[PDB]
Enzyme design. Structure first.
Site, PDB file in Angstrom:
ATOM      1  N   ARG A 296       0.800  -1.209   0.000  1.00 22.85           N
ATOM      2  CA  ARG A 296       0.000   0.000   0.000  1.00 22.85           C
ATOM      3  C   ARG A 296       0.849   1.283   0.000  1.00 22.85           C
ATOM      4  O   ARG A 296       2.090   1.215  -0.084  1.00 22.85           O
ATOM      5  CB  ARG A 296      -0.902  -0.022   1.220  1.00 22.85           C
ATOM      6  CG  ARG A 296      -0.129  -0.038   2.496  1.00 22.85           C
ATOM      7  CD  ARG A 296      -1.010   0.343   3.673  1.00 22.85           C
ATOM      8  NE  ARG A 296      -0.221   0.997   4.717  1.00 22.85           N
ATOM      9  CZ  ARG A 296      -0.241   0.684   6.016  1.00 22.85           C
ATOM     10  NH1 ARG A 296      -1.033  -0.275   6.480  1.00 22.85           N
ATOM     11  NH2 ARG A 296       0.525   1.349   6.865  1.00 22.85           N
ATOM     12  N   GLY A 297       0.161   2.432   0.077  1.00 24.23           N
ATOM     13  CA  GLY A 297       0.762   3.759   0.177  1.00 24.23           C
ATOM     14  C   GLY A 297       1.730   4.076  -0.956  1.00 24.23           C
ATOM     15  O   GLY A 297       1.504   3.698  -2.107  1.00 24.23           O
ATOM     16  N   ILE A 298       2.826   4.748  -0.629  1.00 25.61           N
ATOM     17  CA  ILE A 298       3.838   5.129  -1.633  1.00 25.61           C
ATOM     18  C   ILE A 298       4.440   3.914  -2.312  1.00 25.61           C
ATOM     19  O   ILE A 298       4.622   3.904  -3.531  1.00 25.61           O
ATOM     20  CB  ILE A 298       4.951   6.065  -1.008  1.00 25.61           C
ATOM     21  CG1 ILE A 298       4.315   7.354  -0.482  1.00 25.61           C
ATOM     22  CG2 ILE A 298       6.025   6.378  -2.007  1.00 25.61           C
ATOM     23  CD1 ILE A 298       5.070   7.977   0.568  1.00 25.61           C
TER      24      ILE A 298
ATOM     25  N   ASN B 225      11.858   1.054   0.431  1.00 25.47           N
ATOM     26  CA  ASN B 225      10.705   1.883   0.758  1.00 25.47           C
ATOM     27  C   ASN B 225      10.013   1.465   2.069  1.00 25.47           C
ATOM     28  O   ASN B 225       9.495   2.320   2.791  1.00 25.47           O
ATOM     29  CB  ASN B 225       9.709   1.882  -0.398  1.00 25.47           C
ATOM     30  CG  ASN B 225       8.343   2.432   0.011  1.00 25.47           C
ATOM     31  OD1 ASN B 225       8.127   3.643   0.028  1.00 25.47           O
ATOM     32  ND2 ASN B 225       7.430   1.542   0.368  1.00 25.47           N
ATOM     33  N   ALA B 226       9.991   0.180   2.403  1.00 27.06           N
ATOM     34  CA  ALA B 226       9.312  -0.223   3.643  1.00 27.06           C
ATOM     35  C   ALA B 226       9.808   0.604   4.817  1.00 27.06           C
ATOM     36  O   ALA B 226      11.013   0.826   4.972  1.00 27.06           O
ATOM     37  CB  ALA B 226       9.512  -1.710   3.911  1.00 27.06           C
TER      38      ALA B 226
ATOM     39  N   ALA C   5      11.701  11.086  25.996  1.00 26.08           N
ATOM     40  CA  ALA C   5      11.707  11.070  27.456  1.00 26.08           C
ATOM     41  C   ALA C   5      10.933   9.812  27.958  1.00 26.08           C
ATOM     42  O   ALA C   5      11.467   9.027  28.752  1.00 26.08           O
ATOM     43  CB  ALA C   5      11.150  12.408  28.036  1.00 26.08           C
ATOM     44  N   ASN C   6       9.715   9.638  27.451  1.00 24.30           N
ATOM     45  CA  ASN C   6       8.906   8.473  27.678  1.00 24.30           C
ATOM     46  C   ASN C   6       9.068   7.393  26.598  1.00 24.30           C
ATOM     47  O   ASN C   6       8.065   6.891  26.088  1.00 24.30           O
ATOM     48  CB  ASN C   6       7.431   8.869  27.684  1.00 24.30           C
ATOM     49  CG  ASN C   6       7.207  10.359  27.801  1.00 24.30           C
ATOM     50  OD1 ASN C   6       7.559  10.986  28.802  1.00 24.30           O
ATOM     51  ND2 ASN C   6       6.562  10.928  26.788  1.00 24.30           N
TER      52      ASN C   6
ATOM     53  N   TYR D  33      12.737   7.533  14.475  1.00 25.35           N
ATOM     54  CA  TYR D  33      12.445   7.682  13.071  1.00 25.35           C
ATOM     55  C   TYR D  33      13.421   8.587  12.289  1.00 25.35           C
ATOM     56  O   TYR D  33      13.949   8.158  11.232  1.00 25.35           O
ATOM     57  CB  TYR D  33      11.063   8.249  12.951  1.00 25.35           C
ATOM     58  CG  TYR D  33      10.549   8.381  11.538  1.00 25.35           C
ATOM     59  CD1 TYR D  33      10.094   7.265  10.856  1.00 25.35           C
ATOM     60  CD2 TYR D  33      10.444   9.639  10.912  1.00 25.35           C
ATOM     61  CE1 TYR D  33       9.591   7.379   9.567  1.00 25.35           C
ATOM     62  CE2 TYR D  33       9.944   9.755   9.617  1.00 25.35           C
ATOM     63  CZ  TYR D  33       9.523   8.618   8.969  1.00 25.35           C
ATOM     64  OH  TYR D  33       9.014   8.654   7.714  1.00 25.35           O
TER      65      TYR D  33
HETATM   66  N1  LIG Z   1       4.091  11.477   4.126  1.00 24.27           N
HETATM   67  C1  LIG Z   1       4.599  10.147   4.520  1.00 24.27           C
HETATM   68  O1  LIG Z   1       3.978   9.063   3.922  1.00 24.27           O
HETATM   69  C2  LIG Z   1       6.093  10.041   4.433  1.00 24.27           C
HETATM   70  C3  LIG Z   1       6.920  11.171   4.643  1.00 24.27           C
HETATM   71  C4  LIG Z   1       8.292  10.970   4.592  1.00 24.27           C
HETATM   72  C5  LIG Z   1       8.810   9.676   4.350  1.00 24.27           C
HETATM   73  N2  LIG Z   1       7.994   8.608   4.157  1.00 24.27           N
HETATM   74  C6  LIG Z   1       8.568   7.255   3.913  1.00 24.27           C
HETATM   75  O2  LIG Z   1       8.133   6.731   2.710  1.00 24.27           O
HETATM   76  C7  LIG Z   1       7.841   5.347   2.888  1.00 24.27           C
HETATM   77  C8  LIG Z   1       6.395   5.035   2.712  1.00 24.27           C
HETATM   78  O3  LIG Z   1       5.481   5.327   3.710  1.00 24.27           O
HETATM   79  P1  LIG Z   1       3.914   5.128   3.498  1.00 24.27           P
HETATM   80  O4  LIG Z   1       3.264   6.508   3.692  1.00 24.27           O
HETATM   81  O5  LIG Z   1       3.580   4.564   2.140  1.00 24.27           O
HETATM   82  O6  LIG Z   1       3.444   4.331   4.747  1.00 24.27           O
HETATM   83  P2  LIG Z   1       2.721   2.945   4.801  1.00 24.27           P
HETATM   84  O7  LIG Z   1       2.760   2.510   6.298  1.00 24.27           O
HETATM   85  O8  LIG Z   1       1.324   3.017   4.226  1.00 24.27           O
HETATM   86  O9  LIG Z   1       3.558   1.932   3.858  1.00 24.27           O
HETATM   87  C9  LIG Z   1       4.595   1.105   4.360  1.00 24.27           C
HETATM   88  C10 LIG Z   1       4.455  -0.335   4.012  1.00 24.27           C
HETATM   89  O10 LIG Z   1       5.691  -0.955   4.476  1.00 24.27           O
HETATM   90  C11 LIG Z   1       5.287  -2.186   4.971  1.00 24.27           C
HETATM   91  N3  LIG Z   1       6.260  -2.667   5.944  1.00 24.27           N
HETATM   92  C12 LIG Z   1       6.421  -2.151   7.145  1.00 24.27           C
HETATM   93  N4  LIG Z   1       7.372  -2.861   7.776  1.00 24.27           N
HETATM   94  C13 LIG Z   1       7.798  -3.822   6.926  1.00 24.27           C
HETATM   95  C14 LIG Z   1       8.731  -4.861   7.017  1.00 24.27           C
HETATM   96  N5  LIG Z   1       9.478  -4.992   8.195  1.00 24.27           N
HETATM   97  N6  LIG Z   1       8.935  -5.689   5.957  1.00 24.27           N
HETATM   98  C15 LIG Z   1       8.221  -5.557   4.811  1.00 24.27           C
HETATM   99  N7  LIG Z   1       7.305  -4.576   4.730  1.00 24.27           N
HETATM  100  C16 LIG Z   1       7.084  -3.706   5.752  1.00 24.27           C
HETATM  101  C17 LIG Z   1       3.979  -1.951   5.601  1.00 24.27           C
HETATM  102  O11 LIG Z   1       3.247  -3.143   5.642  1.00 24.27           O
HETATM  103  C18 LIG Z   1       3.332  -1.021   4.647  1.00 24.27           C
HETATM  104  O12 LIG Z   1       2.608  -1.820   3.723  1.00 24.27           O
HETATM  105  C19 LIG Z   1       8.274   5.023   4.242  1.00 24.27           C
HETATM  106  O13 LIG Z   1       9.603   4.545   4.206  1.00 24.27           O
HETATM  107  C20 LIG Z   1       8.195   6.254   4.950  1.00 24.27           C
HETATM  108  O14 LIG Z   1       9.020   6.218   6.042  1.00 24.27           O
HETATM  109  C21 LIG Z   1       6.667   8.776   4.198  1.00 24.27           C
END
Ligand SMILES: NC(=O)c1ccc[n+]([C@@H]2O[C@H](COP(=O)([O-])OP(=O)(O)OC[C@H]3O[C@@H](n4cnc5c(N)ncnc54)[C@H](O)[C@@H]3O)[C@@H](O)[C@H]2O)c1
Ligand SMILES: CCCCCC(=O)SCCNC(=O)CCNC(=O)[C@H](O)C(C)(C)COP(=O)(O)OP(=O)(O)OC[C@H]1O[C@@H](n2cnc3c(N)ncnc32)[C@H](O)[C@@H]1OP(=O)(O)O
Ligand SMILES: CCCCCC(=O)SCCNC(=O)CCNC(=O)[C@H](O)C(C)(C)COP(=O)(O)OP(=O)(O)OC[C@H]1O[C@@H](n2cnc3c(N)ncnc32)[C@H](O)[C@@H]1OP(=O)(O)O
Ligand SMILES: NC(=O)c1ccc[n+]([C@@H]2O[C@H](COP(=O)([O-])OP(=O)(O)OC[C@H]3O[C@@H](n4cnc5c(N)ncnc54)[C@H](O)[C@@H]3O)[C@@H](O)[C@H]2O)c1
Lengths: 416, 416
Positions: free
Chosen positions: B188-190, B260-261, B270-271, B325
């Site tokens: 999903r997502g990006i 990308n994951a 702190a917590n 993060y």
């Molecule tokens: N605006 C934001 O979305 C944003 C901003 C800056 C950076 N990013 C980065 O871009 C990337 C995409 O984020 P997203 O918004 O699509 O979030 P998202 O949580 O929807 O997508 C991440 C996907 O990675 C998968 N995933 C998580 N852990 C995993 C693992 N250990 N092994 C295999 N798959 C795993 C999750 O199942 C999920 O499907 C991320 O790396 C995120 O850190 C996002």
């Protein structure tokens, strides 16, 4: 979420509000304790004035758990206007790629934490050359600056110390003792407060400014116990006039040049005339270049020299209505990075300070009252804060700090 | 001041809304015309789709008047979703300090102007190695990306092209034709939109994601005409499982790895428990490192390779509640800078994309509705925008682009 009374420098007060804990592991924790036993209150339970984590030990990314173990307990116990500093190794110079990856990631840590500290406290990241001798005498000016009220408006930044050893100044409380400092644009604003601070720390100031400024300048020179040279830094002969003024007053030598004079002529590039472009380029960029090459070239500034430039957040992030100005302030970053090698050969450092929202002065008092809050410390800064950073670079013992650009912005939300 | 309908990519439409003017003076204006006569509408009076200033000619700071002379007339005549690009020479590699000072100052110009352009138009600064052969075939992928609807959400950034020559892909409209791309976090997502874009451009995607994701992943693989590998990238054996999946499906070779994951576990330091620290470090940092060394180390990715990392604005500017993060996202910048030399030796580039406020998805819908506007383009971006930048790096002809970090943020006000 409410703005703190920032503790600024005052002679005789202790550098920190509380005790100094120095955890972590690597080549810096030990020698750092040793160098700061004398003037600081070392631990060791009760209100912390400053936490310091030696990060140099971390050699692979799995190591980064270290910051967590050291910081999470101690954070709740951090004083009013306390100072967090993570000291790492220059990432480019690491011994493995793994180490480079870990030391690089620290920036992300120090800047995120700067946005969590409460009650005016600040973070800093300092890299140290792995070629530094174990004493790390090259690192003392920077730690002494950060761990004091002097850094009040410096937050979230990254300092980069090189390999060279350092001699401490005769008296840390008056570091510019017997130095001769040229300040451009000293009639008012930040420039005048630089004169004051430079005077406070024992220096003889040559205070430069235009004919127009007339007497504002004399008031400043008399105030700091200096001399006044009424000169337009863009004049074809600025270098001659200064070397000559030095010939009279200080045997033809000066130790510090501060390229502070600047102007704006804000217009959108679209509706922008030659005079708004050219006038700004001339004061803010060509003259600081011409003055620094000029003054080093004829021997006015020699070994032990210090050049400090006034950059700006605009130079880093850009700003609407300032394509000219921001070109100059980025240009000034250009001067600092381009001349650092040459000048190092000659025993001279050069560094830049990039102010953010400083009060005296900053535009609609509808955007004023907002832009002043857009930073981790929630308040606008003061000329003295910018001058302190500048005095830090000027220090006789800041010889291992060159090519640096430090924002004085209380970790303003805006950047590249 | 009102947000524009950003023109995004659509097959068959022209790359620009208008004609392309290419002023300035130096080693790029000519060969650039030559390389872009075919697919662009060169000038030459009527609505400009893209202005491009060759800056390489500027050799001293007085030269910078050039930008003013070229830009001030033409700006009022800039199209909807037009593209400004200033092409300069790598400042570190200039022939004199004067030239280094001038080329450096350009960043200040391009970022300030990005904040003045109207109606969704953008600026970019691109440096080119002065060792580049006069044709500058190494520069085409970058110009083709910037001068298109594909860069819709990339604004104010700085690209850095090296010396190596480039072969054009068989069809610029399908650049990843016959390439095999691994995407982590594709359920999903990006991550999913990367699969789509990679598919659109002709690539066979291996779409990786956890068991939990179950079928979201199959839906994505079926959608892009790829394969689905259900794998936790942190698993001790992730490298084996992928090389093996490649052994079945693509003769044991892959051309592109997209790391990308990612996850968040936001808490104030702190917590903050070990599990929120460790869980985030493991997915976002150790695994992308381990996967890239893993996959190159056993020959799965070889010459012609492409590694792209997902960084973040948090990694650059820090963020409240994300010391873990942001450490990882800065870490990812660490991976990109540390491995660039080694991998270059092996015919492999590695680059990072740092998203800002992307819609699918981003927290109180009181801060959402604000943070989305805090950028030059006044709107939040879309997954496709981030994927396009990523596809740009993946390009067979982006071989002279390595070690780059590009934000996809529409010039978001926040940064370092
Ligand atoms: N605006 C934001 O979305 C944003 C901003 C800056 C950076 N990013 C980065 O871009 C990337 C995409 O984020 P997203 O918004 O699509 O979030 P998202 O949580 O929807 O997508 C991440 C996907 O990675 C998968 N995933 C998580 N852990 C995993 C693992 N250990 N092994 C295999 N798959 C795993 C999750 O199942 C999920 O499907 C991320 O790396 C995120 O850190 C996002
Ligand atoms: C030493 C002291 C330095 C330290 C002090 C500082 O740095 S403190 C300085 C801080 N300054 C800033 O942050 C910059 C803030 N200033 C501004 O925003 C500027 O004053 C401004 C943009 C409003 C003024 O710009 P201009 O005078 O060029 O243009 P103006 O606002 O009149 O535009 C209106 C007309 O120009 C045309 N026009 C063309 N492009 C346009 C555009 N992108 N947006 C609106 N109008 C545009 C239209 O046809 C319109 O009619
Ligand atoms: C793959 C997906 C990734 C892509 C998605 C994204 O990146 S989108 C994610 C964007 N997220 C963000 O921008 C971060 C926004 N999140 C937040 O601000 C955080 O949720 C939060 C800080 C409110 C939560 O932090 P916590 O749970 O640690 O702490 P909390 O708010 O409960 O603090 C209250 C108690 O802790 C103590 N306390 C200690 N220090 C304190 C402090 N500096 N400020 C307030 N309280 C403090 C007090 O005694 C108080 O009582
Ligand atoms: N918040 C802001 O003040 C801010 C923010 C970022 C950077 N800066 C920079 O810091 C420096 C100080 O600004 P300031 O706020 O004190 O403004 P200011 O206008 O009050 O002070 C500048 C002084 O420089 C003098 N000067 C101008 N042109 C000169 C010339 N050609 N020769 C000699 N003197 C000249 C002026 O007379 C004035 O006295 C500037 O370089 C400025 O660009 C300021």
């Amino acid at each position: 979420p409410q703005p703190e009374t920032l503790r600024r420098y005052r002679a005789g007060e202790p550098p920190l509000t509380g005790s100094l804990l120095i955890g972590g592991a690597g080549r810096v924790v030990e020698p750092l304790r040793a160098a700061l036993e004398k003037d600081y209150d070392l631990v060791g339970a009760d209100s912390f004035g400053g936490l310091v984590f030696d990060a140099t030990g971390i050699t692979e990314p799995a190591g980064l758990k270290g910051l967590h173990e050291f910081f999470t307990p101690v954070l709740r116990n951090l004083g009013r206007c306390g100072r967090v500093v993570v000291v790492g190794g220059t990432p480019e110079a690491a011994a493995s790629t793994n180490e480079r990856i870990a030391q690089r990631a620290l920036e992300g840590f120090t800047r995120s934490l700067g946005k969590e500290l409460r009650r005016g406290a600040t973070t800093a990241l300092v890299y140290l050359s792995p070629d530094a001798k174990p004493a790390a005498t090259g690192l003392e000016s920077t730690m002494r600056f950060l761990l004091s009220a002097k850094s009040a408006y410096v937050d979230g930044q990254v300092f980069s110390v090189g390999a060279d050893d350092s001699t401490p100044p005769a008296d840390w409380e008056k570091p510019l003792d017997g130095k001769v400092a040229i300040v451009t644009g000293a009639a008012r604003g930040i420039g005048a407060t630089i004169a004051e601070v430079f005077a406070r720390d024992g220096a003889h100031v040559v205070a430069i400014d235009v004919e127009s400024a007339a007497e504002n300048l004399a008031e400043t020179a008399s105030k700091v116990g200096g001399t006044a040279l009424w000169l337009d830094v863009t004049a074809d002969d600025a270098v001659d006039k200064i070397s000559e003024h030095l010939r009279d007053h200080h045997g033809g030598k000066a130790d510090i040049l501060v390229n502070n004079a600047g102007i704006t002529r804000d217009k959108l590039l679209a509706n922008m005339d030659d005079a708004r472009w050219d006038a700004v380029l001339a004061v803010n960029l060509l003259a600081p270049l011409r003055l620094t090459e000029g003054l080093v070239g004829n021997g006015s500034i020699g070994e032990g020299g210090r050049v400090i430039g006034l950059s700006s957040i605009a130079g880093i992030a850009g700003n609407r209505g300032q394509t000219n100005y921001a070109t100059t302030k980025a240009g000034m970053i250009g001067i600092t990075q381009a001349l650092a090698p040459g000048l190092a050969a000659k025993g001279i450092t050069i560094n830049a300070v990039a102010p953010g929202f400083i009060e005296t002065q900053m535009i609609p008092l509808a955007t004023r009252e907002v832009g002043r809050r857009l930073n981790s410390l929630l308040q606008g800064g003061q000329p003295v804060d910018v001058a302190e950073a500048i005095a830090y670079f000027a220090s006789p013992a800041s010889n291992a700090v060159t090519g640096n650009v430090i924002r004085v912005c209380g970790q303003a939300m805006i950047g590249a």
